[PDB]
Amino acid sequence: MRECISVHVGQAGVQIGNACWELYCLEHGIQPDGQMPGDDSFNTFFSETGAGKHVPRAVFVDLEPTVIDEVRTGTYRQLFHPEQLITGKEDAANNYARGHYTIGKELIDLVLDRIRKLADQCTGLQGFLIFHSFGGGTGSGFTSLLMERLSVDYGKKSKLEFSIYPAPQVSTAVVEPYNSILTTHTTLEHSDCAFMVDNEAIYDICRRNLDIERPTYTNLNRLIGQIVSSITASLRFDGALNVDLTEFQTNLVPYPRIHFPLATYAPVISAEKAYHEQLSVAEITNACFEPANQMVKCDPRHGKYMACCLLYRGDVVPKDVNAAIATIKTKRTIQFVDWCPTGFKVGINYQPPTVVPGGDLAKVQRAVCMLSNTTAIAEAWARLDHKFDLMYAKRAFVHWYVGEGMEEGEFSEAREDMAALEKDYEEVGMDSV
Amino acid sequence: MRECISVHVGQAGVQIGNACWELYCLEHGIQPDGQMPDDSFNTFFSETGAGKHVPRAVFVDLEPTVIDEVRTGTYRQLFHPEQLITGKEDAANNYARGHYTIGKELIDLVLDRIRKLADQCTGLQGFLIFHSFGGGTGSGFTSLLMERLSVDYGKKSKLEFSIYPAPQVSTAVVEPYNSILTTHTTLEHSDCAFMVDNEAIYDICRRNLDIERPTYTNLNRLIGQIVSSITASLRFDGALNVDLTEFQTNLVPYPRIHFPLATYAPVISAEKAYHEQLSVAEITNACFEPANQMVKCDPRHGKYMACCLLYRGDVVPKDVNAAIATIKTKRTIQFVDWCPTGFKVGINYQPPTVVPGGDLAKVQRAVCMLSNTTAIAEAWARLDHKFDLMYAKRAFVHWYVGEGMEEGEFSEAREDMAALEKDYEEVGMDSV
Amino acid sequence: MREIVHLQAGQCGNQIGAKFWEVISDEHGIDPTGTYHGDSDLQLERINVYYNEATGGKYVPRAVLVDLEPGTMDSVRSGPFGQIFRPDNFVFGQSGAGNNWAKGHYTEGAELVDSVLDVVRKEAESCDCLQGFQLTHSLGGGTGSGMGTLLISKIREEYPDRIMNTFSVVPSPKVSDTVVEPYNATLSVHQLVENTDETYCIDNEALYDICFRTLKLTTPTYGDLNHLVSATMSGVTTCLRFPGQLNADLRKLAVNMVPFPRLHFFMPGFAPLTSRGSQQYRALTVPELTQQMFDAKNMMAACDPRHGRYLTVAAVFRGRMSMKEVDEQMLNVQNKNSSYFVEWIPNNVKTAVCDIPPRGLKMSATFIGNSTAIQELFKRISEQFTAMFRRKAFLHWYTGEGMDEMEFTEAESNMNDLVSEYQQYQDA
Amino acid sequence: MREIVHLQAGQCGNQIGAKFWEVISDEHGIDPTGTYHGDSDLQLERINVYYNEATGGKYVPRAVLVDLEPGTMDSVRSGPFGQIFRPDNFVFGQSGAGNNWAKGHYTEGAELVDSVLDVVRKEAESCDCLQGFQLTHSLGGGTGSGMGTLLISKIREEYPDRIMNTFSVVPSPKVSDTVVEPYNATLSVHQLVENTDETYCIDNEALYDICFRTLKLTTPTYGDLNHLVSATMSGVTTCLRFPGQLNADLRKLAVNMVPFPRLHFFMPGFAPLTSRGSQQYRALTVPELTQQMFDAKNMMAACDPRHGRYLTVAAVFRGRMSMKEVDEQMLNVQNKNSSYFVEWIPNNVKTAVCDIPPRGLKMSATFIGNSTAIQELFKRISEQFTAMFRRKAFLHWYTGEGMDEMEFTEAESNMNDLVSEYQQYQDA
Amino acid sequence: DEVHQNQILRELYLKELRTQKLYTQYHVNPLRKVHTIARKPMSWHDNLEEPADARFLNLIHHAAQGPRKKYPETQTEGQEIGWDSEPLVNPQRDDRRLNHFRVYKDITLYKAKMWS
Ligand SMILES: Nc1nc2c(ncn2[C@@H]2O[C@H](COP(=O)(O)OP(=O)(O)OP(=O)(O)O)[C@@H](O)[C@H]2O)c(=O)[nH]1
Ligand SMILES: Nc1nc2c(ncn2[C@@H]2O[C@H](COP(=O)(O)OP(=O)(O)OP(=O)(O)O)[C@@H](O)[C@H]2O)c(=O)[nH]1
Ligand SMILES: Nc1nc2c(ncn2[C@@H]2O[C@H](COP(=O)(O)OP(=O)(O)O)[C@@H](O)[C@H]2O)c(=O)[nH]1
Ligand SMILES: Nc1nc2c(ncn2[C@@H]2O[C@H](COP(=O)(O)OP(=O)(O)O)[C@@H](O)[C@H]2O)c(=O)[nH]1
Ligand SMILES: [Mg+2]
Ligand SMILES: [Mg+2]
C-alpha cells in the first residue's frame, strides 16, 4: 500500500539520505532504533516487524567501507536492518571504469538481491528513489550499473532520482567532468525523472536566507531532506490535491530525453527572521521563482520554464494558490512557453514541514517544493562540456579510465550524445510558429 | 489599504527615523520591540503573527556605524535584517561614489526589499524618502533610488523630507557641490520634496521650547511630528481628511515648484504652556510668524503660491475658517495673483503624542503648516552662487571626476538650477 | 571592518607608534599581552579596524615594524607594551642606514623591501574593507625618509584606492639634530606629495614649545611628545572605531578637505591640553576648547596661522555635548576672522563628533587645518637646500652611491613648483 | 580492511619510518610495547591498516626493516619506540653498500632482496585487500636507491595492481654530503618512473628551511626533520583510517593527480606549522591554513612553484571544519594565480576532510602537488651528472661490479626525457 | 654569509624566549557570531555528551537583554531615544470619547482580500 524503495547509493547519497532517514524518524514517531511508545502512514518508508519494530526500506550502498560503517556503528544501528547497509571492500577512486566495470561487478549481485527482497515485502511499490552523485566513482559508475540492470528487472516502474551535480566552478574533485558526461550516457535512457541539485547554490541559500556562514555537508544534506519529504509527502499523510510518483513523471517532463527538472525549497528561514515574517501562501510562491533561490546555480531568466510543479505543506487554503500561481504567469520577467500554455501543477499536503532538532530551518506552517523543468540547465551542461573538450583533446586523465576495463571509444560516444542534449534543449527553446 | 513604505537613506534619514519610528510606535501603542501590550498600524506596521508588529522602512547607508546602532538598540527586535540594510565603506561626501561607485554595489538589494514591501501592501500611496542633500549617501544614493522608483512604481507618490544645505551653519565643504547635482536628479521624480534646513530648527528650538541644548536628537524629533501629521489622516480619522495624492494636486503649483516649507504650530515647551492658550486661530496666526518657519527663508521676500494646512486635535471647523480669514485680512501675508482660494485645510481629531523626554508638551491642538512659498528662490540662489564660485576655479572637483561623474555633469546642474530660478519668478510675475 | 594597517618605519616612529599602540590599547581596553580589562560593550564593538582577534581573545595589532638597524625595535620589544606585535612582522635588515636617503631608498633598501611588502600583502589580504595604510616616519632622518617614500611608492602601485595617512616629523629650524637634514627632506617631499593623501606634519620645535607654556612641565623625555602626537592620530580615526551623531571616515577627512591633488599637508592639534595648575580653574565646553584649539600655541606643524590663509579646516570632536554649541562656535570663528580664510571657499569647516569620549576627559577634539603658512616650513628647508646643492655639499655619499645629480635637481624643482602652487591659491 | 605494507629501506629509511611509527602510534593510541591505552575508539576501528593483531591484545606494526648496513636496525631498536617491530622483520645483512648503486642492485644487495621479498610476501598475503607499499628511500647512495628500486621492480610484477607510494629523499641542490650523490639518483629515476605511482620527493634543504626558519628550531637536528616528513606520510593515508566527510585514499589521490603515466613525481607540504612565538598569535582557522600550503617557504622540495605551473593540486584536510571554506578559498587560490596553474585542466583540486584532528592541533592538511617545478630538481641532477660523466669520473666502483657505460647513457636519456615531459605541458 | 646568517637568527630567537608572556584568560566576545559548525546526525564521533559553557549563556543573554538594563547611563547616540519608552501616565487606549482610533468594518476587512 503506497510504498517505495529508497536506494541511497554512493558516498554522496548515503550522507544525503543520512539525515533523510533521521527526518522520517521525526515525522513518524520512529525512535532511534524504531518503536513508538499509530496508523497506516508509516508504510512508504518503514516496514513493520512483529513486536512493533519498523525496519526502513533503504538499500544504502558505498563501494568503500568508510561511511556506512558509521551508520552500523552509530546511534541508529538498531534502526536499519543490517542487510540494507551494504559496503564494498575498496573504493571506486573517482573512476567510471572502476565503479562500473571492475569494483562494482562484485557488489552488483548482493545489492540487486537486497532490492528483490525489499520489493517482495511490498504490495504498493510505486517507485525507486535513488540518491547519488555525478562526480565520484560510486555515484557515477555504480549507480549507472543499477539504473541499467533495474530495467531488465522491475521495469517501467518510476525511477525518480536526486543527485548533486557538478557545481559551476566551485568543485571538490578534478576528473569530475569525465564522470558526469559518462553518467548521462547511461541515465538519459533509463531514469524517468532525475531531479537535480548542486552544492553551490545551497551554500548561498544558507548564506543570505539562513545567515549560518561556513556551512558544512550536513547542513547541505538536511535541506535535501526537506526537499524529498515534500516530494514524497502525498504517499503519506493526507489532505487536498495529492500527487503520487507517477504525477511528476507526466507533468514535469516534456519529450522523452528532456527529463532533468530543478528543485527549490521556499521557506529557507531561521528563528529570528521567521518571528518577523508571516509566510503566507502569496510570498512563499513568489520566492520560488526568484533567481537566487534555485538550487542549481543557473540563471533561469535566460531559459524557458517548460514544465513546473508546485507542492504544498500545511495551512494552504486552495484559493490562495490559484491566485498566487496566476501572478507568477502575468509577470513577463517570469518567461514562459507557448508550446505548452498550461505549464503548472498544484499539490497540497496537510502535514506541516517537520523540524529536525539541532537544525536551522525554523518551524513554518507552509512550504513549497517548486520543481521546474527549465532549459537554464543546458547552460550548466554547456559549461560542463567545454570543461571536457579542453581535457579530452590532449588525452588527460585517460590511463586510469582505460586500463580498468572501459573502451576508449566511450569517451566519444558520451561526448556526441551529450551534445545531442544541448541541441535537444535548444529545439525546445524555439517559439513555435 | 492606505499605507506608506518609508525609506531612510543616509545618517540623516536613519537617525531622524530612529526619532520618527519611536513616535509611530508610542502613538499607536506598540512597545519598543514589536509587541502590542485599531487598524491604524496597518499604514506603517505589519503585524507578523502573535504581536510582532514589524515596521516598514528600508534604512540604507554605505557605512556600518549608524545602521548598527539600531541593529543593537532598544528597538533591535522592531525590524528584520534585510530592512536595516548596511553598506561597506562610505561614499565620503561624494555624489559620485553614492551614484556612480560604492552605491551601485548595494542598489539592486535596496530595490528588492522595497519590491517585497510593495507586494505586501494592498494600496501604496507614497514612498516617503528621507535624504540629507549634501552627502554621498543622502543625495547620490537617493538619486539612483528615486530614479529607479520612477521606472517600477511609475505614477506613485514619493513625498520627501530632507535637510536643506543651510546658508550659514554648514558642517561640510563639498556641501554646495552635491546639492546642485542632486536637485537636478530629484526634479524629474520627487512629486513634492519638503525641506527643513538645520539652521531654522536649531533656532526655533532656542525660543519656542527654550531648549538651551539643540542636539541632533531633539531636532529629528520635531521632523518626526511633521511626517506624523502629514500621514495622520491615512491612520486615525476625524473630519476633512487629506490623502498623500491630494497634498500634491493641491499644493504643487506647476510641474516643478514642489518644495514646501513646514512649521509645527504649538512648539511650546511645558511650564510655558501653563501660561499660554492654543486658540484654533492663535496657532494658525503663529504658524505664519516669520521666525517660527523651519526653513531659512523669510516669506516676506516672495509670495505664497499654495499653502496646505494639516490640523490635529479639538479644531472646530468654524474657528478654522475664521482663522484663515483673519489672516487674509492682513497685507503682510501675501498670496500669488494667479490663485485666490487659499489653502487646502484638513482636521484629524487624534490629538498629538508625547515621546517621553521631548520638550513639545501635550497640546489639545496642532496645525502642521506646509506652504509653497515663492521666496525659496532666496535659498536656492545662495547655493547656485556657492557652487558657481567653486566650480569656477575647479575646486574639490578632481575627486568627483575620478569616481564617475564627468565634468559635464557639474555644468548641466548649474544651468538646470539657474533655469529653476527663472521658473520660480516667472510664476511669481503678477499675471497680466 | 573598514580597517587600517600601521606601517612603522624607524626611530622617529617606532617610539611614536609605540605610544600610538599604547593610546589605542588604553582606550579600546586591552593590556600588556592581550587580556581585555575593558568596562563597556561599545569599547569592543569596533576593534576589527586596528587589531586582529587572536586565539581566544587577546588581540594582536595591524602593525609592521620596518627598520634597517636592529636595536631600534629592541627598545620597542623590551618596552611596557612591546609583546603585542607579531614577532614575525618585526622585519629588519642588517647594516645601518647612516641617515642616507640613497642607502635607504636605493642600495640596502631593496633587500628590506620585498620582505616588507610580503608582510604588508598578507596583512592587507586578511581584511574586510581596506581604506588605510597609516604610516609613521620622519622626513628629517634617513631610515624613515628612505623607507617611507619607497614604501609609499609601491603600495600606490599595488593598492591604488586607499587613504595613505602618513604622520611625519618635518625638518625644522630651531632644533636640528641631523646635519644632512636638508638633504633628507627635498628628496623625500618629492616622493611624498605625489603618492600620498594625508600627511599630518609635526616638528619637534612647536611640539617642544607646547610643553613650555601650555602644560608648563619642567622636563620632557620624548615619551611625553609621543603621547602628545599619538593623541591626534587616535582622534582622526574615532569615527571608524566608535559611533556618534555625525560620522566621518578618512576618505571623508580628505575629499572634503584637500582642495587640489597637492595641498594635503595638514596640521594637527588637541583641544584640552590644560596644565597642572589650570585644569582646576578652567571649564569644559566647546567655547573654552576653541581658544585652546585655534591657538597657534596648541598648533603642532611648525608655523603661525596668522602668516597665511586657511584653505580648508576640520575639527573632529569627541564627547557628550550639544551642537548649536559646535556650530555657533565654528560660525563665529569664520565670520569674526574672515581675512585668513580663503574667500573663494565660502564655508570652511568639517566638524565631526563621536559621543565615545577620551579616557579621563569630559570632552576632547582634534584640530586639522590646511593653512597656507605651511609655506613657512617648505621654503625654509629649500633655502637650506640651496646652500648645499651649489657648493657640492654632503653629497658624494649620494653621488658615489649611484644617485645622479639630476634627481637632486628634481628635488628643489618640484618643491619650488609646490611652494608656488601653495601661494597661488593664497592670492587667487 | 584496506591496509598498507610499510617498507623502510636504506640507511635513511629506517630513521624516517621510526618517526612514522612514532606519530602513527600516538595517533592510533599505541604504547611503546603495543598494548593499546588511548582515549577514543576511532583509533581501533581501522587499527588494521598499519598495525596488525597479536595475542594479548597487542598491536604489532606491518613494517619491513631492510638495510645492508647493520648500524641502523640496532639503533631503531635502541630508541623510544623500538620494541614494537616483529623481530625477524629486521632483515639485515652485514656489509656496507658504500653508497654504490652497483653494490645494492646488481651485486651483494641481491643476496638480501630474496629474503626481504619473503618478509613482505608474508605480511602482504596475510592481509585482506592490500592497496600497496609505501616506501621511504634514500636517493643519495646504495642502500637506498639500490635496494629501493630493486625491491620496487621486484614487487610490481608479483602484485601488478597495487599502489606504489615511494616517498623519496632526492638530492638536495646545494645541501650535499655525498660525492657520488648525483650518480645514484640519475641511475635510479629510470627505475622510479616506470614502477612507482606516487613519488613524493623531498630534499633535506627545504626541510632545513621549514624547521630553522619557518618553525624556528634553534638547533635543528636531523630527527626534527623526520617529524615533518612523517606528517605528509600520515596525512596522505588518513581518510583511509580515520572517518569523516568527503574522503581520499592513494588511488583517489592518484587518478585526479596523475595527468599522464610518467607524471607522478609529486611534491609534499604540511600546513599548520607554527613557531614558539607565533603559535599563540596566529589564529588556527581554514583561511590561514590554505596560504602556507601554496607558499614556497613551506614546501618540502627545492622549488618555488613560480617557475612553472601546477598540473594538479590536492589537499587532504584534517580536522573539524566547514566545507564552504575548504574549497571556495582554494577556488580563490585557483583563479587569483591563473598563470600558476594549467589551463588545460580547468579545476585543479581534490579535497578531503577527516573529522579527527591531529595530536595537539585543531586542524591540519598535508598538501601534495604535481607542479612543473619538479623539473629543476631533475635539471640540476642532470647538470651535476654531465660534469661527472664527461670525463668518466668516479666510475671504477660503478663498473667493477657489472655495470657498463651503455647502461649509464640510458639513465641520463630517460632522465632528461622527464624534464621535457614536464616542459611540454608547461606554458606551451 | 650563510655561516653568519645562522647566528643572526640564533641571537634573535634567544631573546624571544627570555621575554615572552604567555596567554592566561579565554575572553570570548559576546557580540560576534562564533559560527558554529553543524553535527552529523548519524555519528558517534559527534553526537556525544560534551558540556556547554554556563557563562557564555550568561554573556549572550547579557548581550541580548536591553540597553536600558546594560548601562546605568545614556552612553552613545541612539540609546537616549527609546530610553524611557513608558507612557507618562496610563493612556486609557480604549475609550472613543478622547481617543479616536479606527476599526475597519466588515467590508473593509474583507475588501483588502480582493486586491491582495
Ligand atoms: N551535499 C553533499 N555532497 C556530497 C556529499 N558527499 C559527497 N558529495 C559530493 O560528491 C562529490 C564527490 O563525492 P562522492 O561522489 O560521494 O565520492 P564517491 O562516490 O565515493 O567516489 P569514490 O570515492 O571515488 O568512490 C563531491 O563533489 C561532493 O560535492 C555529502 O555528504 N553532501
Ligand atoms: N537631522 C539629522 N541630520 C544629519 C544627521 N547626520 C548628518 N546630518 C546632516 O546631513 C549633512 C550631510 O549628511 P552626512 O553627515 O554626510 O551623512 P550622509 O547624508 O549619510 O552622507 P555620508 O556621510 O556620505 O554617508 C550634514 O551636514 C548634517 O548637517 C542626522 O543624524 N540627523
Ligand atoms: N617625536 C619624536 N621624535 C623623535 C623620536 N625619536 C627620534 N626623533 C626625532 O628624529 C630626529 C632624528 O631622526 P633619525 O633618528 O636620524 O631618523 P632615522 O633615520 O629614521 O633613524 C631627531 O630630531 C628627533 O627629534 C621619538 O620617539 N619621538
Ligand atoms: N632519510 C634519512 N636521511 C638521512 C639520514 N642521514 C642522512 N640523511 C640524508 O640522506 C642523504 C644521504 O643519504 P644516505 O644516508 O647516504 O642514504 P643511504 O644510501 O641509504 O646510506 C643526505 O643528504 C642526508 O641529508 C637518516 O638517518 N635518515
Ligand atoms: Mg567513496
Ligand atoms: Mg554618512
Side-chain angles (χ1 to χ4, degrees), chain C residues 69 136 151 195 275 281 402 421:
Chain C
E69 319 195 351
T136 310
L151 184 58
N195 274 308
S275 178
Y281 309 94
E421 281 195 80

Side-chain angles (χ1 to χ4, degrees), chain A residues 65 69 91 94 173-174 216 399, chain D residues 45-46 245 249 252 256 259 347:
Chain A
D69 186 74
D91 62 355
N94 296 30
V174 181
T216 181
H399 40 86
Chain D
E45 180 273 358
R46 290 288 184 266
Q245 295 175 355
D249 68 2
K252 289 181 71 69
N256 286 36
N347 187 217

Side-chain angles (χ1 to χ4, degrees), chain E residues 86-110:
Chain E
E86 68 272 10
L88 276 296
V89 182
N90 199 2
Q92 303 65 40
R93 274 190 56 259
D94 48 351
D95 53 345
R96 204 61 31 71
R97 44 204 275 189
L98 281 84
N99 300 139
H100 284 277
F101 294 130
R102 283 201 300 261
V103 295
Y104 290 156
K105 301 312 287 185
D106 54 359
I107 285 300
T108 58
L109 308 170
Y110 164 73

Side-chain angles (χ1 to χ4, degrees), chain C residues 10-12 15-16 99 138 141-144 169 177-178 204 207 222 225-226:
Chain C
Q11 316 193 357
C12 332
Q15 258 55 236
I16 280 195
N99 262 327
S138 64
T143 77
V169 176
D177 306 348
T178 304
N204 292 134
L207 191 60
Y222 282 37
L225 269 72
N226 311 323

